[PDB]
Amino acid sequence: PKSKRARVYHLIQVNKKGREAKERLFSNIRETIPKYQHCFVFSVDNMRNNYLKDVRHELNDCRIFFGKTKLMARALGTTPEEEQADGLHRLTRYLTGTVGLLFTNRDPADIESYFSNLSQVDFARAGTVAPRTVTVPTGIVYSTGGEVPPEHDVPVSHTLEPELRRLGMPVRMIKGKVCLGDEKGEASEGYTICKEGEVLDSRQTRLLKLFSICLSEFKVSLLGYWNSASGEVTELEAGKTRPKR
């Protein structure tokens, strides 16, 4: 009946895709399966995963798929009656959560070497434990939160003033400059964004991102793979201990 919220109709150029997208994902995965000798299942647990683009650009000759886990699992076939190939229903067992597929014509040892030597510093992301205590120095605040030397830093922006206040930093707008306390930095104690051994919240993570401070690591875990020639799945060290389907 009445007394309902008004959903906004967005004046937008791109709309929802739905069934056609699901079908083209099935079609792409199924046409990719016969082309490649091995299919790796990898996991990216609590990372931002924007470096997957660099991963693709490095592994151009390998096809990486990162879609919905259930759609990918059924595209490969969850049961040994609807499986496209042998053992693929045993790899859909490793397709559990925030995971992805990597069809390769390469060597498993080379793939594991690459994915063990690839490692990129990245922003904290919520739920991670703090390795160190980040504190914003009292006084004039800069674009790094007192991590780089202050002499080598630029003042933070007055358009970031309100966002910082919303995120909870008791800052002020003094003579065109954002200041925590006063410009003397003698009337207020600093602001500790995160403390050691404390699970970070989204507020703290967003503050760290705004101050351009990275506390987490981007690394891809390789749970297992499947060889088409043997039609066989191999369990790797990471996939030994992960909530399975």
Binding site: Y9, L11, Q13, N15
Partner: peptide, 30 residues
């Protein structure tokens, strides 16, 4: 409110059409 709702509905319809898709003054002036 009637005018606003008519304008909003016209805008929505025109936008949907355009997203799906990929003289008397002259004589009087003379």
């Amino acid at each position: 409110r009637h005018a606003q709702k008519i304008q909003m509905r016209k805008a929505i319809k025109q936008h949907e059409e355009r997203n799906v898709k990929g003289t008397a003054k002259a004589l009087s002036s003379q």
